[PDB]
Amino acid sequence: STGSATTTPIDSLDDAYITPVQIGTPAQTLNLDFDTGSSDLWVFSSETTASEVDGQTIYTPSKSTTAKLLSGATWSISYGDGSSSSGDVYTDTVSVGGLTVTGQAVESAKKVSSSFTEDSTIDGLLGLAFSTLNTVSPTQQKTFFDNAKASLDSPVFTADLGYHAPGTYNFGFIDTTAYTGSITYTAVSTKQGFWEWTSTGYAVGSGTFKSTSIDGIADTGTTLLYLPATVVSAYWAQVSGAKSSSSVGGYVFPCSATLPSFTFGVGSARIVIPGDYIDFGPISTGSSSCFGGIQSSAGIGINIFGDVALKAAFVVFNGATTPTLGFASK
Numbered sequence: 001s002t003g004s005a006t007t008t009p010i011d012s013l014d015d016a017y018i019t020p021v022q023i024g025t026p027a028q029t030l031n032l033d034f035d036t037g038s039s040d041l042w043v044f045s046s047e048t049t050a051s052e053v054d055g056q057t058i059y060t061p062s063k064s065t066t067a068k069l070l071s072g073a074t075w076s077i078s079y080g081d082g083s084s085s086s087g088d089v090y091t092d093t094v095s096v097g098g099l100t101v102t103g104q105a106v107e108s109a110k111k112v113s114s115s116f117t118e119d120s121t122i123d124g125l126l127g128l129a130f131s132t133l134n135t136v137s138p139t140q141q142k143t144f145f146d147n148a149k150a151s152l153d154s155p156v157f158t159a160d161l162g163y164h165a166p167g168t169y170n171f172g173f174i175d176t177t178a179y180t181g182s183i184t185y186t187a188v189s190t191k192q193g194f195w196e197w198t199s200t201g202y203a204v205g206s207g208t209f210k211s212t213s214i215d216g217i218a219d220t221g222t223t224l225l226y227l228p229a230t231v232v233s234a235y236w237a238q239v240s241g242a243k244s245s246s247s248v249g250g251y252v253f254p255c256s257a258t259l260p261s262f263t264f265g266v267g268s269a270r271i272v273i274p275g276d277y278i279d280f281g282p283i284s285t286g287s288s289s290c291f292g293g294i295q296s297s298a299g300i301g302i303n304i305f306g307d308v309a310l311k312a313a314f315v316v317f318n319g320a321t322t323p324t325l326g327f328a329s330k
């Protein structure tokens with residue numbers, strides 16, 4: 001079996017992407033943020049604290065004939081940006097673009113942090129990292145991808161994110177019309193539970209390629225590209241007037257500047273991120289200072305290939321016995 005769903009940016013900056021998901025019987029459609037950096041399927045629900053809901057579509061397990069309360073199970077998650085949520089667990093039927101999984105753990109939020117309340121367009125998250133990161137206690141639960149795996153024609157999912165435009169998440173197959181040239185595959189380490197891989201280097205604009213190992217994670221749930229301080233400094237040194245600002249919390253640049261492109265290596269292949277993708281607009285309404293899409297990972301502890309990098313390529317997440325990541329130009 002296969003699945004295919006359109007993913008759409010939530011705003012004009014591509015801060016996040018939402019994909020419609022059918023949960024329960026009869027179907028209750030919620031717009032979820034597909035996150036390859038986490039492993040919990042959690043949703044806003046009829047149980048969420050009323051004051052912490054501001055425009056989101058909620059899941060109502062009492063209206064679903066296939067919803068079962070997972071007796072005694074709880075969940076609690078803390079994200080890298082300081083956001084969090086927790087609650088109880090149900091099992092229900094979940095479908096993504098025609099691909100159906102019965103008995104999927106649907107984590108019902110009882111409490112959510114302000115950053116989720118403020119994002120009215122995001123009804124929850126669908127975790128696509130390895131199931132070892134799932135927070136359900138006392139019995140850990142599997143991700144949607146892990147449950148669909150045996151039914152899929154091929155144990156893969158692909159991410160084709162659009163730049164200021166809709167894109168696609170495919171499950172079970174590789175659309176050969178979605179990319180140009182060849183797909184280059186690279187090894188994945190599952191030791192930390194992420195789609196962790198090693199980039200072979202970088203180039204800034206039309207500069208010389210610098211061969212250097214950059215260990216990082218392919219994360220659809222993170223907006224920006226977080227790279228080592230040395231790399232980020234070399235990129236922003238090519239933008240006249242750019243500087244790191246402690247009040248803003250990162251590199252800012254004059255909104256009138258032209259940004260050079262950024263190239264990252266995948267084995268012997270190169271993925272070029274156009275400079276326009278690195279512009280995240282004014283730091284505040286009316287400001288002539290713009291926020292950069294390439295920031296330092298020194299305060300995070302891990303390098304993150306977020307939406308800025310992934311949207312410049314067709315990305316294959318191969319969940320075979322030995323996982324690999326494929327990258328192709330598009």
Ligand SMILES: NCc1ccc(C(F)(F)F)cc1
Binds near residue numbers: 079
């Ligand atoms: N990396 C997971 C993640 C995704 C979205 C959000 C936000 F912005 F919606 F709160 C926080 C954390």
